From Swiss-Prot:
Belongs to the filamin family. Disulfide bonds: none annotated. It comes from Homo sapiens (Human). Phosphorylation extent changes in response to cell activation. It is found in: Cytoplasm, Cell cortex; Cytoplasm, Cytoskeleton; Perikaryon; Cell projection, Growth cone. Filamin repeats lie at residues 1-90. The chain holds residues 2236 to 2329 of 2647 of the full protein. This is Filamin-A. Ubiquitous. The gene is FLNA. Homodimer. Interacts with PDLIM2. Interacts with RFLNA and RFLNB. Interacts with FCGR1A, FLNB, FURIN, HSPB7, INPPL1, KCND2, MYOT, MYOZ1, ARHGAP24, PSEN1, PSEN2 and ECSCR. Also interacts with various other binding partners in addition to filamentous actin. Interacts (via N-terminus) with MIS18BP1 (via N-terminus). Interacts (via N-terminus) with TAF1B. Interacts with TMEM67 (via C-terminus) and MKS1. Interacts (via actin-binding domain) with MICALL2 (via CH domain). Interacts (via filamin repeat 5) with SYK; docks SYK to the plasma membrane. Promotes orthogonal branching of actin filaments and links actin filaments to membrane glycoproteins. Anchors various transmembrane proteins to the actin cytoskeleton and serves as a scaffold for a wide range of cytoplasmic signaling proteins. Interaction with FLNB may allow neuroblast migration from the ventricular zone into the cortical plate. Tethers cell surface-localized furin, modulates its rate of internalization and directs its intracellular trafficking. Involved in ciliogenesis. The modification Phosphoserine is found at S49, S92, S94. It is linked to Periventricular nodular heterotopia 1: A developmental disorder characterized by the presence of periventricular nodules of cerebral gray matter, resulting from a failure of neurons to migrate normally from the lateral ventricular proliferative zone, where they are formed, to the cerebral cortex. PVNH1 is an X-linked dominant form. Heterozygous females have normal intelligence but suffer from seizures and various manifestations outside the central nervous system, especially related to the vascular system. Hemizygous affected males die in the prenatal or perinatal period. Otopalatodigital syndrome 1: X-linked dominant multiple congenital anomalies disease mainly characterized by a generalized skeletal dysplasia, mild intellectual disability, hearing loss, cleft palate, and typical facial anomalies. OPD1 belongs to a group of X-linked skeletal dysplasias known as oto-palato-digital syndrome spectrum disorders that also include OPD2, Melnick-Needles syndrome (MNS), and frontometaphyseal dysplasia (FMD). Remodeling of the cytoskeleton is central to the modulation of cell shape and migration. Comprised of a NH2-terminal actin-binding domain, 24 immunoglobulin-like internally homologous repeats and two hinge regions. Repeat 24 and the second hinge domain are important for dimer formation. Filamin repeat 20 interacts with filamin repeat 21 masking the ligand binding site on filamin repeat 21, resulting in an autoinhibited conformation. The autoinhibition can be relieved by ligands like ITGB7 or FBLIM1. Filamin repeats 19 and 21 can simultaneously engage ligands.
Length: 111
């Protein structure tokens, strides 16, 4: 348990543009130590990066190449946090078949 206490928010959980970094944060202070999993699923393979803010928050950014609908999931100890998975329409800025899912897993350790 503990996923219930985690929150995430940011523009990258609402809308994104192909090739533009889509950003959000995850707040894990009340949840404490446990395993955090962050994944992006959609028609292209995401590149995802993380910044451990050392204050019980995490900065996430992902970039996808192809427009379409993507799901961003955030799980804590293998359970979806509130509002996860987030469905995000990715627009063209102003195709190979199948779908991809790229996930990153790391132990959250409060400082």
């Amino acid at each position: 348990g503990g996923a219930h206490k985690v929150r995430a928010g940011g523009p990258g959980l609402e809308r994104a543009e192909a090739g533009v970094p889509a950003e959000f944060s995850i707040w894990t202070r009340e949840a404490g130590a446990g395993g955090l999993a962050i994944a992006v699923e959609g028609p292209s393979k995401a590149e995802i990066s993380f910044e451990d803010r050392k204050d019980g928050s995490c900065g996430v950014a992902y970039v996808v190449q192809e427009p379409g609908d993507y799901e961003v999931s955030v799980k804590f100890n293998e359970e979806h946090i509130p509002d996860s998975p987030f469905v995000v329409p990715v627009a063209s800025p102003s195709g190979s078949s199948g779908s991809w899912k790229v996930g990153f897993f790391k132990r959250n350790r409060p400082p």
